[PDB]
């Protein structure tokens, strides 16, 4: 058993309380949409998979969270981790923009290593809170913590 | 204060005391090398970057340690993890089989995220321990555990 040394993060940062992370992804139309282009709107940075059965439940309450706020008010960015984006979900009638993510990178960028993993921005991109795993997104107190946003 | 809820990994594993994940990279010649072509022998996988004054500070008794060892029985794979491979160090008279991981994909699989990082592979592929952080590779508890595993 050999004792660990000195070490530096190579990670860059992802902090609740700061300014998230940029990125500009494409969507399934292959135009780009980023971040930032949402500021003054609350947005729910979503990553997901297929495959998880927590990413596919939590859907039904994110997609009534949306369609009960004021149009575009709450903006989600459900940016699918896989490989070749899954097919079916191209015609899901849900209120989400879908991202793929190919490289990885923004992913990575996130440390979003468990999924479902959603980070709550609020209107002045400030990182507000991380919510890893599957939740009730259409819940009386997610929905008053969002409005507490506005 | 939102609770979390179910989630599931989105990484591949990496253990001590289980069989290590394959990789190939390109060398500085532009030949490639993989981790099971040296089954057989006592591997170091070891993740660094040219800033990481951790990284720099080790190498001199990493040299010593391999230059020690009967010839090819302690194999060093020297992962560099950053975008252009740090030209200097292509000239360094060390016995370190510099590699580079340009996508990023070997140094995500390795959760290698702090540097230097160095998994120490036996001669049967085990991973046997990890290491985080720079230490002195030539001191004695170091060389007796290494000669431990042949």
Do not use: H
Not at 10 to 18: F, H, K, N
Not at 39 to 49: D, H, Q, T, Y
Not at 91 to 117: C, E, H, I, K, M
Not at 118 to 129: L, S
């Amino acid at each position: 058993s050999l004792a660990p040394g000195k070490a530096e993060s190579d990670a860059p940062l992802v902090r609740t309380g700061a300014l998230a992370p940029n990125f500009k992804l494409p969507t399934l139309s292959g135009e780009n949409k980023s971040l930032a282009q949402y500021r003054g709107k609350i947005v729910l940075v979503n990553f997901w998979a297929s495959w998880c059965p927590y990413c596919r439940d939590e859907m039904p309450s994110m997609d009534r969270l949306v369609k009960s706020f004021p149009k575009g008010d709450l903006v989600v960015l459900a940016v699918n981790v896989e490989k070749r984006f899954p097919e079916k979900y191209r015609r899901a009638p849900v209120s989400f923009n879908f991202l793929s993510d190919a490289t990885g990178q923004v992913q990575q960028r996130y440390g979003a290593n468990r999924l479902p993993d959603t980070f709550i921005v609020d209107r002045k991109g400030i990182i507000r809170q991380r919510v890893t795993g599957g939740i009730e997104w259409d819940a009386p107190k997610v929905v008053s913590y969002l409005k507490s946003l506005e």
